[PDB]
Amino acid sequence: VKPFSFVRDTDPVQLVNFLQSEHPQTIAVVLSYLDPPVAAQILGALPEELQTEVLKRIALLERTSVKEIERNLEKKISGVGGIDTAAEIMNNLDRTTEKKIMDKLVQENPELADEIRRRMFVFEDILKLDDRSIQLVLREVDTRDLALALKGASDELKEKIFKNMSKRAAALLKDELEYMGPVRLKDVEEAQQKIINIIRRLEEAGEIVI
């Protein structure tokens, strides 16, 4: 079973009560093991002074120093946490708290802040992109992944994507949808994740405009 799994079984406040007086690092460890919405809920309820530091430690969980990297590597060779975890927690925080943590990271860890922000991109964020960028992305997506990803998108996002496809691609997509049928929710999920990865890569290449 997974560590800290008894957390959803534990009380609400007594939970924040104990974590409050623990070392930030110890806090980072416990939260990085929980479902993000749960972690975001706890994080936002922690004393303001711990929020940023704890979020940063979650982001750099086993990357804190060259020594830590060297040690962790050796373990895996012989016998959790990270940027994604942090970004997922930030997406589930209330806007206000999220903004405060991001503003501080921008000031003290500008790079890490940038890694987290870019990792925070969700499928609906595609609505933030301009039409040209969207077309750029579409050329990198196969018909089936697109169809799957769309079964989990808002009608508005559906539209903005459609009006940006080539006539031939749109026809192929429509065909897929017609003979696709019901699908496992997790397929819709990885399809969207796949498109998101394409976006994350196209911006690392500095060719994606918001």
Numbering used by the authors: 105 to 169, 173 to 186, 195 to 325
Paper excerpt:
FliG forms a ring on the cytoplasmic face of the MS ring. directly involved in the switching of the flagellar motor. generation and in stator assembly around the rotor.
deletion at positions 169 to 171. deletion, indicating that the motor is locked in the CW state. to the one introduced by the in-frame PAA deletion. is different from that of Tm-FliGMC. is also different in these two structures. here, we propose a new model for arrangement of FliG subunits in the motor. interaction between helix E and FliGM of the neighbor. the orientation of the neighboring FliGM domain. orientation of FliGCC to cause anomalous switching behavior. change in the interaction between FliGCC and MotA.
